[PDB]
Amino acid sequence: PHEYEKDGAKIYVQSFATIRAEADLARFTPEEEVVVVRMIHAAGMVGLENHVRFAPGMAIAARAALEAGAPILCDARMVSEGITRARLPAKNEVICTLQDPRVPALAQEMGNTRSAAALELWRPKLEGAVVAIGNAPTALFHLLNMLEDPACPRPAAIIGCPVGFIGAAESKAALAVANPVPWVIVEGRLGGSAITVAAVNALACRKE
Amino acid sequence: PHEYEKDGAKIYVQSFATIRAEADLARFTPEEEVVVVRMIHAAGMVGLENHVRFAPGMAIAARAALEAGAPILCDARMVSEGITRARLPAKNEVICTLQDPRVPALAQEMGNTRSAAALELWRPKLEGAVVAIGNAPTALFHLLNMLEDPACPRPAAIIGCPVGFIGAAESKAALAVANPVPWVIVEGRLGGSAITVAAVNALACRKE
Numbered sequence: 001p002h003e004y005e006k007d008g009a010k011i012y013v014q015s016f017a018t019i020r021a022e023a024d025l026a027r028f029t030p031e032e033e034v035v036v037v038r039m040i041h042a043a044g045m046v047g048l049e050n051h052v053r054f055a056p057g058m059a060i061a062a063r064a065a066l067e068a069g070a071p072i073l074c075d076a077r078m079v080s081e082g083i084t085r086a087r088l089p090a091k092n093e094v095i096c097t098l099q100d101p102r103v104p105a106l107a108q109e110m111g112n113t114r115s116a117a118a119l120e121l122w123r124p125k126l127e128g129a130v131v132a133i134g135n136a137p138t139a140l141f142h143l144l145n146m147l148e149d150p151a152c153p154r155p156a157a158i159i160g161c162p163v164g165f166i167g168a169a170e171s172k173a174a175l176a177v178a179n180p181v182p183w184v185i186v187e188g189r190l191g192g193s194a195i196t197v198a199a200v201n202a203l204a205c206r207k208e
Numbered sequence: 209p210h211e212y213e214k215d216g217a218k219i220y221v222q223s224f225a226t227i228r229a230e231a232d233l234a235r236f237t238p239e240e241e242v243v244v245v246r247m248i249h250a251a252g253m254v255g256l257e258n259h260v261r262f263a264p265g266m267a268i269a270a271r272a273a274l275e276a277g278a279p280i281l282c283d284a285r286m287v288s289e290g291i292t293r294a295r296l297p298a299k300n301e302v303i304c305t306l307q308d309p310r311v312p313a314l315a316q317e318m319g320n321t322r323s324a325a326a327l328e329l330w331r332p333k334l335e336g337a338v339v340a341i342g343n344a345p346t347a348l349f350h351l352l353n354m355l356e357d358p359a360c361p362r363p364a365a366i367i368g369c370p371v372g373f374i375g376a377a378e379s380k381a382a383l384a385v386a387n388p389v390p391w392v393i394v395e396g397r398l399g400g401s402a403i404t405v406a407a408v409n410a411l412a413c414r415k416e
């Protein structure tokens with residue numbers, strides 16, 4: 001039979017050590033470095049770190065919000081379903097409104113995507129939330145427009161990591177320029193649900 | 209306010225056209241090419257195609273199995289939750305046994321990961337199934353060992369795309385060498401749930 005390593009806790013340790021031995025992580029603060037390592041781990045890609053950008057203090061602020069019980073608002077089910085419940089510090093609610101039955105008609109009325117329209121349903125949980133956008137550039141652009149209104153509830157942090165060829169790089173560059181609340185992005189086309197989930201999981205628990 | 213493209217159907221078309229204009233896709237058959245384009249789209253990474261390998265006839269065989277009602281067996285919830293139900297041709301069941309309450313003790317008894325142990329519960333649905341492994345190298349290695357027993361039910365196809373630094377590249381290279389059933393892999397460290405889901409979604413429906 002095929003022989004292979006079967007100890008999961010050991011595989012995690014070995015993966016993180018391989019990443020730290022290869023990656024270019026010097027510019028990151030200790031709180032940022034742990035997040036970047038987990039993102040590289042999720043992507044299977046040393047080199048991803050050259051694209052990661054944080055607002056100063058974001059990693060400290062997002063961990064404090066999660067420890068205070070902040071909900072995590074997710075643009076897609078792959079993100080909400082990926083968050084490790086066992087790593088959550090304060091029984092944090094993990095929400096995704098994409099599949100709400102009111103979303104298809106609301107998107108039609110708004111002239112926007114279902115991913116963006118679903119963010120309107122985040123309003124009651126948005127104040128102090130940790131936002132996790134790993135898919136949809138239109139959700140990130142729409143959130144920036146929602147936050148231009150002073151009446152809109154404001155999240156504690158935004159993990160803005162949508163992936164893609166159309167609008168993704170622009171949505172993340174616009175988030176960093178707008179600086180609405182503390183943020184982290186993967187500049188360019190890279191991103192996605194796995195990288196976004198890894199950022200949430202890294203910030204949720206102090207143990208790698 | 210920020211201006212951006214809001215037509216989702218249009219964004220998909222533009223994304224696929226950008227990928228076809230940049231990517232090195234000549235070696236793929238027409239059935240394989242559509243799968244590779246969707247995988248690049250999910251990853252946000254032209255260049256991913258240099259790592260993709262298919263067994264001859266896999267893309268045709270996997271689409272035929274899905275059209276015949278084959279279940280899709282997934283190593284992780286990010287994979288099962290990512291599959292687009294609307295693209296499924298024959299009310300295909302999408303299964304993930306990772307969270308079954310019997311898995312933690314079975315993994316302890318087997319001396320293996322929860323991801324690998326959960327595959328034992330796939331046995332009743334495995335004959336003719338489409339396997340979608342996007343996370344766990346130990347699930348892919350364990351499946352290869354299960355299939356060395358002639359009594360084991362055999363899937364119609366394996367999408368073997370686990371990501372990672374430890375065991376991932378080896379598990380996928382071992383799947384291609386063993387050639388148990390038709391397969392597709394992303395050679396090396398790259399892979400993951402998004403790429404795996406994109407392969408399933410591409411094979412499920414004839415419309416991109």
Ligand SMILES: C[C@H]1C2=N[C@H]([C@H](CC(=O)O)[C@@]2(C)CCC(=O)O)[C@]2(C)N/C(=C\C3=NC(=C\C4=NC1=C(CCC(=O)O)C4(C)C)/[C@@H](CCC(=O)O)[C@]3(C)CC(=O)O)[C@@H](CCC(=O)O)[C@]2(C)CC(=O)O
Nearest residue numbers: 076077113114115136137138164165166192193216223402
């Ligand atoms: C094409 C655009 C859009 N994708 C639709 C969305 C549907 C909608 O919201 O109306 C629309 C049409 C619009 C989203 C938007 O552009 O903001 C949505 C979000 N994608 C989903 C799955 C997939 N998307 C991926 C990447 C991208 N997709 C899009 C991109 C935009 C840029 C581009 O095309 O290059 C990028 C981001 C690349 C892969 C996942 C990536 C990951 O997890 O890492 C995967 C798996 C690829 C695949 O389709 O096979 C469903 C997520 C459902 C959920 O989680 O609840 C979805 C709601 C469609 C559906 O099934 O109904």
Ligand SMILES: C[C@H]1C2=N[C@H]([C@H](CC(=O)O)[C@@]2(C)CCC(=O)O)[C@]2(C)N/C(=C\C3=NC(=C\C4=NC1=C(CCC(=O)O)C4(C)C)/[C@@H](CCC(=O)O)[C@]3(C)CC(=O)O)[C@@H](CCC(=O)O)[C@]2(C)CC(=O)O
Nearest residue numbers: 008015194284285321322323344345346372373374400401
């Ligand atoms: C470290 C190893 C393992 N990961 C555990 C698994 C737990 C277990 O099965 O016992 C164990 C410990 C073992 C799996 C194995 O190696 O086969 C499992 C599968 N990972 C999960 C999430 C994550 N994994 C990722 C990648 C990898 N992880 C591992 C790798 C192995 C190689 C390496 O480390 O480089 C790679 C594959 C890189 C990212 C997702 C990647 C994606 O979707 O694209 C993300 C999000 C990273 C993160 O942890 O933040 C849960 C999936 C749960 C589910 O879907 O139901 C999990 C069951 C743990 C949990 O939360 O209980």
